[PDB]
């Protein structure tokens, strides 16, 4: 009407192919056409949860700058094809896929050991070519769900994750969408004029679902907009915080300090799960603790007192609040 006009709704998920999909939002009042069009295009192209491959491992090869007797392409080409490979994980967020193959011919996506929670979007995608009778490859493929695009360089988190030599990092490029075209048109409103129907076609990996992608992008937009739907002078800095300095690792059981289960039952033989209770327990209760001789006592002295703590320290503040 004059004010408080009407909202649109999704009225088509028309798909022409496995990937090229079309949706038709309608009806947009006026000027909202380009608004929502460009906004949804930016959101979709920017951030959609994809699950491309991230970490691969082939038993024969050491570094991706090598070859393998039997495979037509180099390991580099294999990794690039893998990055090209798309997949849809359903159950978990990260998964491991084994691909075993032998004999002459092209190794494609279907040949991998699929699962139930994992589904190959298109199997005909060629991975490599074996060009010898008794030539074979087995490979593990880490596939994790993520948003956006992270290169192989910065994804390093420690100094031992790469130490397994066979772990080849493929720079993950997970975004189901590939291009987002859109355009406004005169919606066939039953009785009004120049209302706008917004047609959006998405060319994608086929992984994500078109209407699902639209609704996810709209949720993202609404969440980001909620920031200044009620904006006011707000500041997260609350200087001079007040919190008890009790260390939280004391709340956990003792067994969470990377040691065996026999020593665990040993500290379960004195009925001491807590670290916040063992902290009031010096070494005056170890050889008297059931079956603490040399080996299990060696574990107790190694994995506990080395992490910066001490086996029994007097404190007066416990437990807030366990």
Partner 1 sequence: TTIKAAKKMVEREEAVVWDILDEVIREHPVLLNRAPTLHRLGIQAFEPVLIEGKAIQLHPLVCAAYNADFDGDQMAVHVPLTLEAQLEARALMMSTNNILSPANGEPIIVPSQDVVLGLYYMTRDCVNAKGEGMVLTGPKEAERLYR
Partner 2 sequence: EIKELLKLGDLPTSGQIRLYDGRTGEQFERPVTVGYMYMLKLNHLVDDKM
By the 10 Å C-beta count (0-12 exposed, 13-18 middle, 19+ buried), 64 is classed as middle
* Among candidate residues 164, 178, 313, the one with its CA nearest the CA of residue 250: 313
> Does 34 help bind partner 2 (rule: CB under 8 A)?
yes
Backbone angles phi, psi at 320, to 5 degrees: -95, 110
Size of the site for a second copy (CB under 8 A): 54
Which tokens in the block code for residue 70? 């039997």
> Does 150 help bind a second copy (rule: CB under 8 A)?
no
> Does 53 help bind a second copy (rule: CB under 8 A)?
no
Which region, judged by CB under 8 A, interacts with partner 2, from 33-41, 157-165, 189-197, 208-216? 33-41
107 close to 30: Cβ distance less than 8 angstroms: no
Q: What is the DSSP string of 109-144?
A: GGGS---SSEEES-TT-EEEEE-STT-EEEEEEEEE
The listed partner (a second copy, partner 1, partner 2, none) that binds 76, CB under 5 to 8 Å by sort, is: partner 1
Rounded distance between C-alpha atoms, residue 169 and residue 63, angstroms: 10
The listed partner (a second copy, partner 1, partner 2, none) that binds 79, CB under 5 to 8 Å by sort, is: partner 1
Size of the site for partner 1 (CB under 8 A): 26
Q: Could you count the other beta carbons within 10 Å of the beta carbon of residue 119?
A: 12
> Does 178 help bind partner 1 (rule: CB under 8 A)?
yes
CB of 42 to partner 2, least distance (A): 7
> Does 160 help bind partner 1 (rule: CB under 8 A)?
no
Answer for which of 62, 225, 313, 315 binds a second copy (CB under 8 A) is: 225
Which region, judged by CB under 8 A, interacts with a second copy, from 60-68, 215-223, 243-251, 260-268? 215-223
> Does 30 help bind a second copy (rule: CB under 8 A)?
yes
Place of tokens 């902290």: 279
Answer for which of 6, 11, 18, 42 binds partner 2 (CB under 8 A) is: 42
> Does 145 help bind a second copy (rule: CB under 8 A)?
yes
Answer for which of 6, 11, 62, 76 binds partner 1 (CB under 8 A) is: 76
Q: Where are the beta strands (DSSP E) in the chain?
A: 9-10, 21-28, 49-50, 53-58, 87-89, 94-102, 105-108, 118-120, 126-130, 136-144, 146-147, 168-169, 177-186, 196-204
DSSP, collapsed to helix, strand or coil, labels residue 55 as strand
User: What letter does residue 271 receive in the DSSP assignment?
Assistant: T
**Interacting residue ranges for partner 2, rule: CB under 8 A:** 34-35, 37-38, 41-42
**Interacting residue ranges for partner 1, rule: CB under 8 A:** 41, 45, 76, 79-81, 83-84, 149, 151-153, 171, 173, 175, 177-180, 186, 188, 190-191, 193-194, 203
């Amino acid at each position: 009407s004059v004010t408080e006009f009407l909202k649109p709704r999704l009225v088509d998920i028309e798909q022409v192919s496995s990937t090229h999909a079309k949706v038709t939002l309608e009806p947009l009042e006026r000027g909202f056409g380009h608004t929502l069009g460009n906004a949804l295009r930016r959101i979709l192209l920017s951030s959609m949860p994809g699950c491309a491959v991230t970490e691969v491992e082939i038993d024969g090869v050491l570094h991706e700058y090598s070859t393998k007797e039997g495979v037509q392409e180099d390991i580099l080409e294999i990794l690039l094809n893998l990055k090209g490979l798309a997949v849809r994980v359903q159950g978990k967020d990260e998964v491991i896929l084994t691909l075993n193959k032998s004999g002459i011919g092209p190794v494609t996506a279907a040949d991998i050991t699929h699962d139930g929670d994992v589904e190959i979007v298109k199997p005909q995608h060629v991975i490599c070519h074996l060009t010898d009778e008794n030539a074979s490859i087995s490979m593990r493929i880490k596939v994790q769900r993520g948003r956006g695009y992270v290169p192989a360089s910065t994804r390093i988190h420690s100094e031992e994750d790469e130490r397994p030599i066979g772990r080849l990092l493929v720079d993950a490029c997970y975004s189901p969408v590939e291009r987002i075209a859109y355009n406004v048109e005169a919606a066939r409103v039953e009785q009004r004029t120049d209302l706008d129907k917004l047609v959006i076609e998405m060319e994608t990996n086929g992984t994500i679902d078109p209407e699902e992608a639209i609704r996810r992008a709209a949720t993202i937009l609404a969440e980001q907009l909620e920031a200044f739907v009620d904006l006011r002078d707000v500041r997260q800095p609350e200087v001079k915080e007040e919190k008890p300095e009790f260390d939280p690792i004391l709340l956990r059981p003792v067994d969470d300090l990377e040691l065996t289960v026999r020593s665990a039952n040993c500290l379960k033989a004195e009925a001491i799960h807590y670290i916040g209770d063992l902290v009031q327990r010096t070494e005056v209760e170890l050889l008297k603790t059931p079956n603490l001789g040399k080996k299990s006592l060696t574990e107790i002295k190694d994995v506990l007192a080395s992490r910066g703590l001490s086996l029994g320290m007097r404190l007066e503040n416990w437990p807030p609040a366990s």
